[PDB]
Amino acid sequence: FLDALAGFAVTLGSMFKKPITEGYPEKPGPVAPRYHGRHQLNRYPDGLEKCIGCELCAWACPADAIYVEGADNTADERYSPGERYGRVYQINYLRCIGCGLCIEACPTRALTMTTEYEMADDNRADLIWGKDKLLAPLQEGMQAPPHDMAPGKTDDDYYLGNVTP
Amino acid sequence: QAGERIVVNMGPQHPSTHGVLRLILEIEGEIITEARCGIGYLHTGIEKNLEYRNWTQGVTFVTRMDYLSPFFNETAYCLGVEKLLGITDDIPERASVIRVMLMELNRISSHLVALATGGMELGAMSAMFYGFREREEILRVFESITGLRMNHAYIRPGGLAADLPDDAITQVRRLVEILPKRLKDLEDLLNENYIWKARTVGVGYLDLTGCMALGITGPILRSTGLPHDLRKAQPYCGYENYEFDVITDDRCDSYGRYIIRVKEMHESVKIVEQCLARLKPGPVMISDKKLAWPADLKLGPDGLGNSPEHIAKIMGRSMEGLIHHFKLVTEGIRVPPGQVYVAVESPRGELGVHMVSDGGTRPYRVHYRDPSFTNLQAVAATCEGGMVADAIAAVASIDPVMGGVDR
Amino acid sequence: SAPLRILVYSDNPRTREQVRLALGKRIHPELPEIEYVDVATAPMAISQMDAGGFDLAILDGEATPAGGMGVAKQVKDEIDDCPPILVLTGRADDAWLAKWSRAEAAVPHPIDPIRLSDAVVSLLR
Amino acid sequence: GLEERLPGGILLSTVETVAGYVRKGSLWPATFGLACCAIEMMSTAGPRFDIARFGMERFSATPRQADLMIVAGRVSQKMAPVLRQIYDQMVEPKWVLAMGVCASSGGMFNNYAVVQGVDHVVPVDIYLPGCPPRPEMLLHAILKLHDKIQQMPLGVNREEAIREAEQAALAVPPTIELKGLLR
Amino acid sequence: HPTPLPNPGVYARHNSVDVPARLPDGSESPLSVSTILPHRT
Amino acid sequence: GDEPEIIAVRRGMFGNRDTGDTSGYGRLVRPVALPGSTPRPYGGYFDAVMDRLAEVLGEERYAMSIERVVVYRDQLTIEVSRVQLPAVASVLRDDPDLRFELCLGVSGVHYPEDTGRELHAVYPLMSITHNRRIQLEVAAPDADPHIPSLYAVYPTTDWHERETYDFFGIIFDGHPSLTRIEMPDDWEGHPQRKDYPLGGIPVEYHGAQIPPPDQRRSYS
Amino acid sequence: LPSFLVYVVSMVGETNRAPFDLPEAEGELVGGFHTEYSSLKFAMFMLAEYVNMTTVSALATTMFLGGWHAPFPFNLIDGANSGWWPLLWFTAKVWTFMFLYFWLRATLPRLRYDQFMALGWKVLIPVSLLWIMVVAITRSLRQHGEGTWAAWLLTAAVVVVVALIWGLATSLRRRTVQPPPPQSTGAYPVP
Numbered sequence A: 001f002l003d004a005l006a007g008f009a010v011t012l013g014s015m016f017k018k019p020i021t022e023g024y025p026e027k028p029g030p031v032a033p034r035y036h037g038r039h040q041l042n043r044y045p046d047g048l049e050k051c052i053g054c055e056l057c058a059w060a061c062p063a064d065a066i067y068v069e070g071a072d073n074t075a076d077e078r079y080s081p082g083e084r085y086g087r088v089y090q091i092n093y094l095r096c097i098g099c100g101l102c103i104e105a106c107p108t109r110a111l112t113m114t115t116e117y118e119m120a121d122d123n124r125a126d127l128i129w130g131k132d133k134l135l136a137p138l139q140e141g142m143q144a145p146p147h148d149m150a151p152g153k154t155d156d157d158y159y160l161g162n163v164t165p
Numbered sequence B: 001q002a003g004e005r006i007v008v009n010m011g012p013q014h015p016s017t018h019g020v021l022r023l024i025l026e027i028e029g030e031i032i033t034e035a036r037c038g039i040g041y042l043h044t045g046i047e048k049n050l051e052y053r054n055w056t057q058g059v060t061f062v063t064r065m066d067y068l069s070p071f072f073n074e075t076a077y078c079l080g081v082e083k084l085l086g087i088t089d090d091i092p093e094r095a096s097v098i099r100v101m102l103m104e105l106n107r108i109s110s111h112l113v114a115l116a117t118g119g120m121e122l123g124a125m126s127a128m129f130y131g132f133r134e135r136e137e138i139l140r141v142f143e144s145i146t147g148l149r150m151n152h153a154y155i156r157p158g159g160l161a162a163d164l165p166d167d168a169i170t171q172v173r174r175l176v177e178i179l180p181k182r183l184k185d186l187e188d189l190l191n192e193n194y195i196w197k198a199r200t201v202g203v204g205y206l207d208l209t210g211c212m213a214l215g216i217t218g219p220i221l222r223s224t225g226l227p228h229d230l231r232k233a234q235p236y237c238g239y240e241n242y243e244f245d246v247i248t249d250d251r252c253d254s255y256g257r258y259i260i261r262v263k264e265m266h267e268s269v270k271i272v273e274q275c276l277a278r279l280k281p282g283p284v285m286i287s288d289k290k291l292a293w294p295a296d297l298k299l300g301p302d303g304l305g306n307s308p309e310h311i312a313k314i315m316g317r318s319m320e321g322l323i324h325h326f327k328l329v330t331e332g333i334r335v336p337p338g339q340v341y342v343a344v345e346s347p348r349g350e351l352g353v354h355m356v357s358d359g360g361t362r363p364y365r366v367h368y369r370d371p372s373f374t375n376l377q378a379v380a381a382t383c384e385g386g387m388v389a390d391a392i393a394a395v396a397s398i399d400p401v402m403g404g405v406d407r
Numbered sequence C: 001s002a003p004l005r006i007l008v009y010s011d012n013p014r015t016r017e018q019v020r021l022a023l024g025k026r027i028h029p030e031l032p033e034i035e036y037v038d039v040a041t042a043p044m045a046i047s048q049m050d051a052g053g054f055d056l057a058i059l060d061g062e063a064t065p066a067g068g069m070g071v072a073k074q075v076k077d078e079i080d081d082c083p084p085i086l087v088l089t090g091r092a093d094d095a096w097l098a099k100w101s102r103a104e105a106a107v108p109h110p111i112d113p114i115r116l117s118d119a120v121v122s123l124l125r
Numbered sequence D: 001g002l003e004e005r006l007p008g009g010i011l012l013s014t015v016e017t018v019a020g021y022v023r024k025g026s027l028w029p030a031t032f033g034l035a036c037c038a039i040e041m042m043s044t045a046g047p048r049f050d051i052a053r054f055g056m057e058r059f060s061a062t063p064r065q066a067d068l069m070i071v072a073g074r075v076s077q078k079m080a081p082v083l084r085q086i087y088d089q090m091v092e093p094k095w096v097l098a099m100g101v102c103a104s105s106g107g108m109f110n111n112y113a114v115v116q117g118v119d120h121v122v123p124v125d126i127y128l129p130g131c132p133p134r135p136e137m138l139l140h141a142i143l144k145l146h147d148k149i150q151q152m153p154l155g156v157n158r159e160e161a162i163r164e165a166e167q168a169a170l171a172v173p174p175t176i177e178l179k180g181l182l183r
Numbered sequence E: 001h002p003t004p005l006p007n008p009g010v011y012a013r014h015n016s017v018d019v020p021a022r023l024p025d026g027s028e029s030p031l032s033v034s035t036i037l038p039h040r041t
Numbered sequence F: 001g002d003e004p005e006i007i008a009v010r011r012g013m014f015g016n017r018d019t020g021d022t023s024g025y026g027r028l029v030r031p032v033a034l035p036g037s038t039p040r041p042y043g044g045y046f047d048a049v050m051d052r053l054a055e056v057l058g059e060e061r062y063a064m065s066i067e068r069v070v071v072y073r074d075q076l077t078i079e080v081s082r083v084q085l086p087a088v089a090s091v092l093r094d095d096p097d098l099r100f101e102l103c104l105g106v107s108g109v110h111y112p113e114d115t116g117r118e119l120h121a122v123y124p125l126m127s128i129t130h131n132r133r134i135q136l137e138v139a140a141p142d143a144d145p146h147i148p149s150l151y152a153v154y155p156t157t158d159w160h161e162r163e164t165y166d167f168f169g170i171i172f173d174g175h176p177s178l179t180r181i182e183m184p185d186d187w188e189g190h191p192q193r194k195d196y197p198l199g200g201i202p203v204e205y206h207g208a209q210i211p212p213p214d215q216r217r218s219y220s
Numbered sequence G: 001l002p003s004f005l006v007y008v009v010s011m012v013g014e015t016n017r018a019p020f021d022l023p024e025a026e027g028e029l030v031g032g033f034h035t036e037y038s039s040l041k042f043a044m045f046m047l048a049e050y051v052n053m054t055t056v057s058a059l060a061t062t063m064f065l066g067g068w069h070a071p072f073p074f075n076l077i078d079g080a081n082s083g084w085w086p087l088l089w090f091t092a093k094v095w096t097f098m099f100l101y102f103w104l105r106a107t108l109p110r111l112r113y114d115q116f117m118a119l120g121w122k123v124l125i126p127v128s129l130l131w132i133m134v135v136a137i138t139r140s141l142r143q144h145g146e147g148t149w150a151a152w153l154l155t156a157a158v159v160v161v162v163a164l165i166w167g168l169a170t171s172l173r174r175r176t177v178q179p180p181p182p183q184s185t186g187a188y189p190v191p
């Protein structure tokens, strides 16, 4: 019975097929759009930080991988709409489990999870990513965070989405 | 006598012992005269750590025991939480269908890992690679649906973490179409192979009486011809609505268990096709806002996060919506005091969950009767008297996942 | 008469400061003078103990790149006639590993100055 | 090793670079998977990826032939002695990759049963986040370790590098003292 | 019959197969260590 | 007893163990009671199973052995009196009409506020022949944590009696060897007891650290 | 061909290669014999394994594949069996045997060494011993002019051998087994 040798056909045939390996790192494979990559702190179109420092993301984290401290948005130095912003925001990626409960928790969409995943270091401390590393890059039309809200607008306008560069 | 007997640690660090299983074997020559199991090298205190996290956080914990059956752990947990809540009848039909589909794809994935690691332990080097190719297709589907390749927390008390993405259904159809063809490759390597049969057939014999005495379940039990499956007996998640045959064999040996797993993959493919047919648009979370997970994840240029519509509703328009979001996210639902036992048919047998709530927002006591833990009691029966090589095959047939064993 | 030489290993400079503060130039006037060799990296500690000439080693179990218990096990498996090892444990449940490290004594964090001094005296006596 | 007795200069520099290139390739992992991260190592070896492309296909079953100990899993208390024994029974040079949050820092399991980081028992060369880290993240960490190995010194250079790293590490303040912007 | 016989005791500093497991009363479990081995460790 | 089994008494609204973040809400006293005995007409096959159990066991023995019957969420839990556990287990396993051949394990749970009944062992039994499920609940005091080991009746209870002894200290007397299975034999304490601390460490952060969740506030 | 097949099986056994691979048996003995070996000592064990593979492949080429003689597609070329081309042909055939080695490793699981010994003594040794007698009788007959008897005996012997080996592989290794009786523990009702 040639059936007992069927395996030899499988391996031999697969010899002549193009290998299915993804070419990471030179040609990295496509991650799912919904993949739970690095957390990211997002900004409003005018550049203000979305994070209001409510600590809900930290509240919901099962691994205590987020440390957040809020501070007042004083008129001289405002970073987010409303009266609170996240002054200190750290994610201990050696405790993060990528569960995504933080982004589900966030009430402002300030915290998202990008598809970026490359992360590693030889030092434990270097993987405690602070606010500086997590903040999204400043895009076109955005100003420095320490600036007053958009003219003729208020927190409710930001949350309703009625703000533009 | 003693002079002719060695005692050797098959040990945690050993290719066939999944790194954290310690088979202490007393061998006369190379025949396993006696067997013992050092367990707990992978203990994690998950059961105790659950007690300090709310519900819907314990999902992330339970999914990380029996990590090869994440969706089964999550489904058992969520079925228990809902049963304590008394909302098992309120789960949306779409949520139940998705739970069944995911558990069946997960059964295919877990059986693929079992066959891969067993073949590699038995020298079938290409078996691991082909099994992991099929598993990688399944994991692409899982990643698209849940955003994670493993330890998903996608199934939540009262439904699912989020609805399927638009492309998930097409990917699952593509699986239902290609997966049997790919599994044909792995089956060809092993099913009828003379060496494979010689290596597994008649190895690790365990009669039905032994399975009952040790409380064995899953493929090991059903290799004795008993068609016991919790999906048919004591149905859950609406398994009663699916036409599938309980795979069983009468060999009672390693090859019978292997064939049972192979055939269960095909049965799971059939069940997933049925799920696709039954799948209808609708909610994936209970309508009861007092319990429903308030988050609404959506994608954008920024990434994955709470949908702007939900953000607007809770920060701009609804005070009650904001309160509900805040509370259900932060401390979570509080489950009425009670004590429940809920069982599912994980790929390795009856995955049972004894769960106790003291009326608080955290589970008072969660215990998993992981099938691997009980199945490992069959190693003494299935290894004693055979050679060490036969012991490898028997242990692989038990297909333990030490995460579920130790927990 | 010889100044007892003590190796203090910890990635955290504050743990080294606390150890060097609970212990002083003399643990007691009846004891010889004490000299401290601070080491922040496990390779350096291993090299120092390879050179010998140490009467006690205080290894921080909480050391980041290489915990103190691992270093204790390594030194007792690698240096012949190595000095007694005192391990600082970051939690009560680490006590078991402190035993596994075979460290002659274990002192939990936060370092109680008197407990550390008493343990050091017991090890040197 | 006579390679260490070699005097500095172009000879020792060339020996160092050749050894680094050789050791970054053929970096055989130890067959030592734990918990769920082990499934991700196996996937990394699986066809979709290919650990073999980096010369790392041979998962040395015995610690003797293993060069890299990818802990890759959560280390329970009872397992720490076993893990240390395996690490010791590997032979120089040795490297440890703490794959996953559990291996690196105990991850989500901050309790009695878990060791709270592999580094508590063996020197860790690279920390790799993730729970589990997807295979691309594992390959990224492995390539970072390759870069680290390539620059690894030898002999008198090794001694000088150890002394310099000591001098640098003695000064860094602890993480608890980085109070930047804290209220 | 004692299912799989009890595993040998795992103590800090001692985890060989020779080591006997500890019963709740603190006594060494005879079944924990194979009879062929000399009771020790 | 006949009243529902109070396992904990929580004082104050909002499920707060401490004194209260807001004044004036701490005066509520609500005992957390696990369900008491069910009225006799048990639903489904539970009524038949108990009728058969009371037929096989003598009326006197049935009264002595079955402390309570709780039908909660369409699940039957027989609060069996300690000491009598082996007898009722044998009856359930061997009797043709009961025939609970498959004992699924033994789960320990701790009720530090449940005086005289702090430790509970749960035996999920399944009868494949009749396709039935029940649970047995056996209570032992924290001061006398002994329970009859079902090893003779259900060998599978081995490694479950051992695990529950390891994590709760329940001494299943008569067990062939009740040694620790998960924890090292040298371990001190029984981790899953409520009094046993979680044993975590603070999570480090630049300039701060988050204590383990057991030390921090909770509103269970 | 029978001698060639027996020799092929036996050399795959000799080189400790899959599907035999018994002395190493990574999945059963961690590293087998070369456990406790590191550096160039382990390297030399592997080097010896591969040099033995090359030696047995070359010996198979010598005895059965005409050694270095050019194969049929090139045999028609003038000078193919002359100069340095024979080196190319010998290398090609040796590497076909190496390909067979790698193919077996990729495809087949590893046997239990008792099963390998059963194969060797119940199949290989008997088959080769019978084949020697068959070949001797056939050659003697044709040398004495009884060619028809020689051909008939050869065909009948090979047919009988392939039938009996099939019987051993399927009849002696029966694909049937008995049932089992109950015991102390109560058992469910089987289907």
Ligand SMILES: CC(C)=CCC/C(C)=C\CC/C(C)=C/CC/C(C)=C\CC/C(C)=C/CC/C(C)=C/CC/C(C)=C/CC/C(C)=C/CC/C(C)=C\CC1=C(C)C(=O)c2ccccc2C1=O
Binding pocket: B014, B015, B016, B017, B018, B019, B020, B117, B125, B128, B400, B401, B402, D030, D031, D032, D033, D034, D035, D038, D039, D041, D042, D045, D057, D058, D059, G040, G042, G043, G044, G046, G047
């Ligand atoms: C000496 C000298 C200087 C001479 C001069 C000339 C000169 C320089 C050279 C001469 C020639 C020489 C000597 C060359 C040197 C090289 C040499 C001799 C040979 C070595 C190279 C070699 C033998 C290569 C080929 C070997 C080969 C094909 C290797 C591939 C093996 C494979 C496929 C490995 C993959 C296995 C794999 C997927 C491993 C993962 C398993 C791990 C780590 C996880 C553990 C684990 C497992 C295993 C579970 O089962 C499991 C199941 C369920 C849950 C969890 C787990 C779990 O945790």
Ligand code: SF4
Binding pocket: A050, A051, A052, A053, A054, A055, A056, A057, A058, A068, A086, A105, A106, A107, A108, A109, A110, A111
């Ligand atoms: S990221 Fe979101 S949840 Fe976290 S503090 Fe900022 S606004 Fe609140």
Ligand code: SF4
Binding pocket: A039, A057, A060, A061, A062, A063, A064, A065, A066, A091, A095, A096, A097, A098, A099, A100, A101, A102, A103
């Ligand atoms: S992914 Fe999960 S564990 Fe990680 S920071 Fe976000 S919420 Fe916390």
Ligand code: SF4
Binding pocket: A097, B064, B067, B151, D034, D035, D036, D037, D072, D073, D074, D099, D100, D101, D102, D103, D107, D130, D131, D132, D133
């Ligand atoms: S890091 Fe995550 S996936 Fe890896 S062992 Fe820990 S819990 Fe499992």
